């Protein structure tokens, strides 16, 4: 529904889809050569179908070709400060592909807008749709534009004759978060047969180790998934298949 | 709150019509034959 969508949203009003309780093989993201940019920072792209996280959010939008380099932790710029701010400790990935053949009219596609005037930098993962007239000067702007009162949004000129730097690029970002809640979205990772009372390599919701699993009697609460010790090591584990 | 290295004060007297000709990139008799201001003028002008 994201990649094969007929239309997208603006820069500041990016589309945010939260995903929960699904599988992703991630193999389609590697063989597809249509992606012009594919930068994974928090987690390596090769080791993606073997980890697992709690939740994931996909933020998709369409920007200019020159702004594609602005989606990076610590990067500054117009879009990076007034349209979409990325945290420094961002654990996720970014994909981007050129679509000048689709999102460009014969005379110019002006349906895409971007925020260029704002008196403060945006917060990480913040969405602002404030259409209030920006006050560039010292005179008050009481809903009237003109001198020292300009519109906070500006339209993109998407023509098929523009250079590669001024071409429309569809950019999606995947942000992963891992909490003590049961991990929902990750690769398929078919469950192996459960074996008890043997020194084996165990793997539970990404937590990998070596040990012997035995029956227990500790009554864990329904929201308690993992149990830690004084040395921050795992002592008891709840089977993600059966209680 | 910014304090610089050196100051240059150019003082003169012009006509009432030449008051508009004191600016970077101005055209006129005074701005071309008497006193011309550079395009990258870093300063200020006070006329009374």
């Amino acid at each position, epitope marked *: 529904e994201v990649f094969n969508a007929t239309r997208f949203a603006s820069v500041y009003a990016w589309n945010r889809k939260r995903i929960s309780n699904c599988v992703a093989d991630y193999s389609v993201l590697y063989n597809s050569a249509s992606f012009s940019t594919f930068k994974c920072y928090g987690v390596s792209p090769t080791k993606l179908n073997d980890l697992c996280f709690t939740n994931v959010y996909a933020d998709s939008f369409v920007i200019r070709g020159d702004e594609v380099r602005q989606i990076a932790p610590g990067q500054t710029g117009k879009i990076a400060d007034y349209n979409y701010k990325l945290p420094d400790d961002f654990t996720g990935c970014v994909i981007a592909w050129n679509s000048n053949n689709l999102d460009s009219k014969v005379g110019g596609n*002006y349906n895409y807008l971007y925020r260029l005037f704002r008196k403060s930098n945006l917060k990480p993962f913040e969405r602002d749709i404030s259409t209030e007239i920006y006050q560039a000067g010292s005179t008050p702007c009481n809903g009237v534009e003109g001198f020292n009162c300009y519109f906070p949004l500006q339209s993109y*000129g998407f023509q098929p004759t523009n250079g590669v730097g001024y071409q429309p690029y569809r950019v999606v970002v995947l942000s992963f978060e891992l909490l003590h809640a049961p991990a929902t979205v990750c690769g398929p990772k078919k469950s192996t047969n459960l074996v008890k009372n043997k020194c084996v390599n165990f793997n539970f919701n990404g937590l990998t180790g070596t040990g012997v699993l035995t029956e227990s009697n500790k009554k864990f609460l329904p929201f308690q998934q993992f149990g830690r010790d004084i040395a921050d090591t795992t002592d008891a584990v709840r089977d993600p298949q059966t209680l | 709150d910014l304090c610089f290295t050196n100051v240059y004060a150019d003082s003169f007297v012009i006509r009432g019509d030449e008051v508009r000709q004191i600016a970077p990139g101005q055209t006129g008799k005074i701005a071309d034959y008497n006193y011309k201001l550079p395009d990258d003028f870093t300063g200020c002008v006070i006329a009374w």
Partner: antibody
Amino acid sequence: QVQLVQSGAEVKKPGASVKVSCKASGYTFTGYYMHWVRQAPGQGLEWMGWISPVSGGTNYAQKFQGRVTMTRDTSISTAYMELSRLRSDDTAVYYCARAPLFPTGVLAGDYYYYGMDVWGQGTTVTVS
Amino acid sequence: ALTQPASVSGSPGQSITISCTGTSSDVGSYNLVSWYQQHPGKAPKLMIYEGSKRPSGVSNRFSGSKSGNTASLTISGLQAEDEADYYCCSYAGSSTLVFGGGTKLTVL
């Protein structure tokens, strides 16, 4: 090459309304405050309003404030002007006006400068 | 709302000038002056921007000035082609970039 085609001539009855079309191309359409400037036959030229295809923002003359409704469709990149409650001195040739710069001249006074690309002609003959 | 001559007469090669007075609020307070030239059956063509600055392509013979509330367009070396109307304007506080009575320049 900024090309600008204005709609055809019109005859109207007074007190009615007239709508003139204004189709632009050859440039970044939405990046301009486009004005609408009129002129009675053999008279002086008379400005009426302007519009931003971006954000739909516009501003009219107080003389026209109330009788003029200016719209635009950026998809076909075409601005439109309407004048209701027509009368005799409204008989005139009207044009739009594409502006010189872009209002990315943050304080480049845009768009309080000019109309560089003017339109052919629209003759409104308001005669009973 | 500005006041320029309706018609000015000059000879070829002569330096003629057409003024237009606004108010202390429009001309006397803003270097946002405008000078257009229009030929019969033709669209208005900008000649002078910002009081004395010439847009790209405009011939140097057109010079701009302003004193208090009156702007001035000086055409040195009048030519036969210099026959046209001139329309000055000044920002008026709102809307917007209109003009004077318009002056037809004739070259005897």
